[PDB]
Design a protein around this nucleic acid. Structure first.
Ligand SMILES: C/C=C\C=C\[C@@H]1O[C@](O)([C@H](CC)C(=O)NC/C=C/C=C(\C)[C@@H](OC)[C@@H](C)[C@@H]2O[C@H](/C=C/C=C/C=C(\C)C(=O)c3c(O)cc[nH]c3=O)[C@H](O)[C@@H]2O)[C@H](O)[C@H](O)C1(C)C
Ligand SMILES: Nc1nc2c(ncn2[C@@H]2O[C@H](COP(=O)(O)OP(=O)(O)O)[C@@H](O)[C@H]2O)c(=O)[nH]1
Ligand SMILES: [Zn+2]
Lengths: 208, 83, 385, 99
RNA sequence: AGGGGCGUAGUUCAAUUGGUAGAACACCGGUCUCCAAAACCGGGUGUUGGGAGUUCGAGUCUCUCCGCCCCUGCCA
RNA sequence: CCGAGGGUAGGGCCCGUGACUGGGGCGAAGUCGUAACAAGGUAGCUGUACCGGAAGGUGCGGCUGGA
RNA sequence: UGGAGAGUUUGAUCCUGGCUCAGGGUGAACGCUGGCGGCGUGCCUAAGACAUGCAAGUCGUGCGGGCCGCGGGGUUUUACUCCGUGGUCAGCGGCGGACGGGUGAGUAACGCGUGGGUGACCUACCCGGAAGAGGGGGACAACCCGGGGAAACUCGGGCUAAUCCCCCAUGUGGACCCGCCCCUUGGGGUGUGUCCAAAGGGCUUUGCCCGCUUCCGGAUGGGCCCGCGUCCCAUCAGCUAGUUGGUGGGGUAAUGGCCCACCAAGGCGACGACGGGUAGCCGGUCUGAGAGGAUGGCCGGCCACAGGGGCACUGAGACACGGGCCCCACUCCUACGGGAGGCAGCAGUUAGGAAUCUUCCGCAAUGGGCGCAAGCCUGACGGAGCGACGCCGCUUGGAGGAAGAAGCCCUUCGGGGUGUAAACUCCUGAACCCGGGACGAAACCCCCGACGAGGGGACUGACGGUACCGGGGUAAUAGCGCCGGCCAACUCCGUGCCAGCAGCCGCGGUAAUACGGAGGGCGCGAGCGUUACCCGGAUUCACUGGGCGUAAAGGG
């Protein structure tokens, strides 16, 4: 299940710093900032020119690790992404963005994705009225995601909703910092997601 | 004779029927001479019942024995309201 | 066409003992006809019974004889009291002492003595001289031999006038009455121990049957707690893994039982189990209570020769057979260092690893035998593995 | 151990006799007719044949024959007889076969 | 559950007069070789199925126990 | 009359098996030679026939994939 | 909207070619491990054998009795028990048990698929239309009584009722023979002759509701026939006497050598007859870029079978899964002359097997049979149970936290690694606690209105006190594989061609990224591997899409 284990360890290994921890993985110490190299007893030595295979794995893992999704859903979502009309690169990314917990984190609320998940698993999150607890919930157009009323006075929702004064949300999501709402105006685009992931490779990983 | 019953589709704890004109001797969900409507007994959808007419009456005007619930639904869709 | 079983009278089971061809097995085949004239309406141990108008009884008539010890024993522990049958002929003989000895190594309390074969040449100072030897014998063994209700009579003769008319009452025939003196002998003296029903559960397996149309049935006496139909149970003992099942049936002497209490001899039809998966020894308890263990540091007291035990002593690496609940295993022994001098009459503790997993729980008792004699008894302490 | 059904075997046996007889009757009567129609007995020929025909259509009343089974048995008579008489006889009794 | 059997090196088989238990062929250890095979020297390497028992000693004779084979048992 | 099945009898097809026997495959370090590979020490190969512990030899004709 | 290749012949090269791997899939099984839920799904083998219980009945408004509880004495008493209501045991009549449910043995064939034919046919109950429903007669059960028997039951005498049976009449009409007209294989009209009908039951009573009879039409469901399509062996090449055709019959709802006499001598075959092996066919399912290849489990259509085998009876329909007759094998009872039985229905046992479940609850719903109706029956069906057997969702926590504890592991002794990982701090609250708690169910029926349309009323929930909602609430599971190359991931020790690994290439003979253990890493995660089998890759049977001088391959 959704990994659960050392993460600022993948911050490393994939070689492209990540913040799966939010606060700290943002400080002068994302783990990377002290060992921009792979874990293990080796981790810091001559690297063979990565096999054309290795490359894609690395690209997929990179992308997938970024979300916390299990391989099963990931591929699954990718297959779906395929049939749907349009470019898989774009589409699949979009579908990766609709993931409730993701929107939860993409919209203040949660500092980390892993924390945006526990929020949805515990109920604190809500959608078009009725609350949803499935991280995999697939958000659509025009749906605002409000917090709950029993949480609003929680020590956490405060600070995390506090870092919202000033900062601006993605070009495809609004936000009523006061009355915790925020809608999902429209599916994100390739560009908007400034992600260190070469989608077309990840795609190629699923060809063979 | 040639009845007018309901064949259970949908799934476990999710009824959804199909108003059909089958030869009484078939199985409930077996083959069937023709379909003329559906019925979601749990309503859950503004249209849990919809049925054809010119055809319902047709089979009715040729010896098609409706069932208790079947006849009910037919009626409820203004099948016998002769005006 | 089965018939239920209803509780009213207390339940107690007992068995016969004596020298091979003597009185038992036939005494049994008579004591039954008695308690059957007024009610109920109508080589291998033979679980039977009889309902006196005073109590419910389950008779265990172990075939007896030598060679049949392993089987003899497993039945002795199942009873609260035994009927020591003795004949008027050769009188107290070898296997009459042997069975009695065992009885006093199984905890078997109280003994009812019934002299059979009296119908053979009435010797004046004999049926009065026989009881002498007996009582003295029960004493050479520490038994309460001096308060045992000794009654005489040719049991079988009480049967000829039964196997021709199943309606014989009391009084008539100084034989078929003669057998009511042994009933009012067990009705008295031999108590009725308290069987705790506040405990988990446990039924040592004795025999296993494949009842046609229903499946495997495990017969056994209850160690404690209770078990009715539809209760999850586990089979702990032998086997590679402890398999779990649901009790789909319970019966008392081929009669539907509505609820089993301790002390009861009941057959258990387990849901989905092969006659090859269950076997004597292993027990049936509540999922969770007790588990399986091969090694233990039990406290043991090696009997003294002058009382059957060894007269030499064993060195660490002695492989004997330990008796648990209803069966016997085998196991190497390791001494707690320097103690490589455990000889007769001694009393110590050590390590033992049975080559067959068996239910062990620390607080359980057992015996040790090798070479045809109980070399020592004891109790278990916390398990190693 | 048992059930209704039996009620069906008993009736079975009954109805069996009911038309087993009606049957072998039409048979012996169909024979006699021709057994004369080729004799020359035109008169006492169309007489029993007239009876036969009765018994045939009569059997059709019940579960004995019905439809063409009865209709057919008829032709192969009014054909077997009619084509047995015109072999030197002339249809006397205008009672039965059509003139 | 109860009878009757067989278990000896690495494997096939002897000592069945109560006496540390040997033959064959293998294998192992050196020597030569990178290492083997050959060749030359030199070795019984064995829980005598386990464990106890009589005893001056038990492979042989008692009992118990393990695995396997065989016959015969077993509807709460 | 027909008729399931049962007999007696003789065929066909398939499978199992048999003392013994034919050749085949495979198998770290066995025996005998030396056919072939370099006119491989008699160019080779080939159909056939006779012969020979064995590879093979020889005869007749053929091929060059032999100078 | 759709196509990826790699390893391996050599000292090296190019080519040919085989083997092997990476991807999907499975009614799965085996190993390690295992928390929840939803929807699925579960004897692939012995069509082996089976203890129990249950899978089909219902109508008294078709008809006559027995019997028990009771209006209340018939006569004035317990004698005509007449009568009256609801019951109740079988009987007689009726409709249904020929559907629904199981299985795949058999079948290579009009069995199936697809398209048609029938002037060669049938079709219970249901519809619309036409006309009728009048005289009469009789039987056998049940029951009383006698009898043989262990039983199952059987026989004899005698009452008796019908919607049972039979006779006459009526002939709207219909059937048959012959003539004629239209028409074209036997269809439709007509005329003379013959032949054929029928039941009364309940009320609320010159009327209705339920039935009845004959004909016509409609529906629906079927039978029979035909074209094309449907596996491997040619080391199977010739097969055939009811054989092929005819004539007249028998037979059938109906065509037909289907069956039979008699006559003719035919019919079939390399376009594969006959024979052997295997197999139920299809919609579809898996794979595939496609063309194809494989398959045919769950659901739906067709077929076939009901211990093995033959046969009919009843009936609209069966040669009939829980009907009958008989032979056989096996199961049991037996008072030894004859008796009972068939789980490939449901749940369960045993055997076989690598392997496949509960003797569960409910007719509440849908469907079904019988019923005027109430209602009864219904292991069809609706559900619950068991197994990660599959798919889908969910959990084992989130956020802080050191130039970085310990332990373990490496180390050029300075250090590096597992690692923000932990511990530690705040932190949300899977489970579980208390309370509330369904949708699935609105008709039949009752009242109004005529029992029609429409309007109103009442009963009814197996799953379940489950889902779901509210409030309370503890940090609470991790494994399996793999790390020489293919193929993502490397270091120490042990071992020393041993022990072992191995899908292919190949590793191991004292420094082994290849054995075994460890540290560390990689993949995936309630799973992860293994074995088996299908497609792919394999343009490696090549139609799409290959080849033959010397690689296999040109016939002398
Ligand atoms: C023995 C088999 C199974 C035992 C199982 C278990 O035993 C127990 O663990 C039990 C717990 C104490 C146990 O350990 N039993 C294990 C032991 C227990 C021993 C206890 C009591 C004693 O005391 C020293 C007791 C008999 C004592 O002996 C004396 C007898 C001496 C006899 C000498 C023999 C004589 C003349 C003779 O002719 C003779 C002979 O008999 C045999 C053979 N050849 C002979 O020639 C006297 O009679 C005393 O009374 C529990 O009861 C368990 O619940 C159990 C029943 C499952
Ligand atoms: N004379 C006599 N014979 C007896 C007596 N008890 C049993 N029997 C006989 O002993 C023989 C049976 O022995 P059994 O009952 O089997 O004793 P078990 O061997 O102890 O079971 C038979 O002949 C019985 O009739 C008795 O008390 N007196
Ligand atoms: Zn980080």
């Amino acid at each position: 299940g959704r990994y659960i284990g050392p993460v600022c360890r993948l911050c490393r290994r994939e070689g492209v710093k990540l913040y799966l921890k939010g606060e700290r993985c943002y400080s002068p110490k994302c783990a990377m900032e002290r060992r921009p190299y792979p874990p293990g007893q080796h981790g810091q030595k001559r690297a063979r020119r990565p096999s054309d295979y290795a490359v894609r794995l690395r690209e997929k893992q990179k992308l997938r690790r970024i979300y916390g999704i299990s391989e099963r859903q990931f591929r699954n979502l990718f297959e779906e992404a395929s049939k749907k009309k349009g470019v898989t690169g774009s589409v699949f990314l979009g579908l990766l963005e609709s993931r409730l917990d993701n929107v939860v984190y993409r919209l203040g609320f949660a500092v980390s994705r892993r924390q945006a998940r526990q929020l949805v698993r515990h109920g604190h999150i809500t959608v078009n009225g009725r609350r949803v607890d499935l991280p995999s919930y697939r958000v659509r157009p025009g749906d605002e995601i409000a917090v709950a009323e029993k949480s609003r006075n929680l020590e956490l929702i405060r600070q995390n909703l506090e870092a919202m004064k000033g900062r601006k949300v993605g070009p495809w999501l609004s936000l009523d910092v006061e009355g915790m709402k925020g809608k999902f105006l429209r599916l994100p685009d390739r560009e908007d997601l400034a992600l260190p992931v070469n989608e077309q490779l990840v795609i190629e990983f699923y060809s063979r | 004779m040639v009845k007018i019953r309901l064949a259970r589709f949908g799934s476990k704890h999710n009824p959804h029927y199909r108003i059909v004109v089958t030869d009484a001797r078939r199985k409930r969900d077996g083959k069937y001479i023709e379909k003329i409507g559906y019925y979601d007994p749990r309503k859950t959808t503004p249209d849990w019942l919809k049925v054809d007419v010119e055809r319902a009456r047709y089979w009715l005007s040729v010896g098609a024995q409706p069932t208790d619930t079947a006849r009910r639904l037919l009626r409820q869709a203004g099948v016998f309201r002769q005006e | 066409a089965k018939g239920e079983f209803v509780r009213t009278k207390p339940h107690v089971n007992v068995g016969t003992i004596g020298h091979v061809d003597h009185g038992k097995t036939t005494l049994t085949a008579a004591l039954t006809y008695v308690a059957a004239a007024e009610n109920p309406n109508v080589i291998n141990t033979a679980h039977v019974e009889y309902e006196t108008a005073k109590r419910h009884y389950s008779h265990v008539d172990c075939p007896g004889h030598a060679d049949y010890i392993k089987n003899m024993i497993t039945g002795a522990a199942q009873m609260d009291g035994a009927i020591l049958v003795v004949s008027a002929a050769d009188g107290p003989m070898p296997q009459t002492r042997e069975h009695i000895l065992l009885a006093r190594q199984v905890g078997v309390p109280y003994i009812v003595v019934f002299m059979n074969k009296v119908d053979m040449v009435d010797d004046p100072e004999l049926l009065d001289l026989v009881e002498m030897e007996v009582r003295d014998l029960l004493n050479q063994y520490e038994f309460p031999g001096d308060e045992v209700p000794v009654i005489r009579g040719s049991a079988l003769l009480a049967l000829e006038q039964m196997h021709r008319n199943p309606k014989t009452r009391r009084g008539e025939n100084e034989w078929v009455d003669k057998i009511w003196e042994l009933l009012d002998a067990i009705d008295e003296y031999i108590p009725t121990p308290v069987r705790d029903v506040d405990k988990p559960f446990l039924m040592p397996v004795e025999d296993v049957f494949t009842i046609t149309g229903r499946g495997t049935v495990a017969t056994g006496r209850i160690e404690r707690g209770k078990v009715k139909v539809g209760d999850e149970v586990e089979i702990v003992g032998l086997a590679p893994e402890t398999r779990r099942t649901v009790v789909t049936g319970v019966e008392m002497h081929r009669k539907t039982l509505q609820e089993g209490i301790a002390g009861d001899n009941v057959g258990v039809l387990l849901r989905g189990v092969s006659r090859e998966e269950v076997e004597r020894g292993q027990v049936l308890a509540k999922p969770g209570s007790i588990t399986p263990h091969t090694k233990f540091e039990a406290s043991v007291y090696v009997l003294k020769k002058e009382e059957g035990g060894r007269h030499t002593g064993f060195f660490s690496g002695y492989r004997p057979q330990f008796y648990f609940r209803t069966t016997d295993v085998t196991g190497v022994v390791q001494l707690p260092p320097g103690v490589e001098m455990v000889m007769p009459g001694d009393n110590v503790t050590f390590t033992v690893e049975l080559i067959k997993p068996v239910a062990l729980e620390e607080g359980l008792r057992f015996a040790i035998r090798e070479g045809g004699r109980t070399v020592g008894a004891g109790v278990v302490t916390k398990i190693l593995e | 151990r048992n059930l209704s059904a039996l009620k069906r075997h008993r009736q079975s046996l009954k109805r069996r006799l009911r038309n087993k007889a009606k049957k072998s009757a039409i048979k012996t009567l169909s024979k006699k007719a021709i057994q004369l129609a080729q004799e020359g007995k035109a008169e006492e020929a169309l007489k029993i044949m007239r009876k036969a025909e009765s018994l045939i259509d009569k059997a059709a009343k019940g579960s004995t024959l019905h439809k063409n089974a009865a209709a057919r048995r008829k032709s192969r008579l009014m054909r077997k007889v009619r084509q047995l008489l015109e072999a030197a006889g002339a249809p006397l009794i205008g009672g039965g076969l059509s003139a």
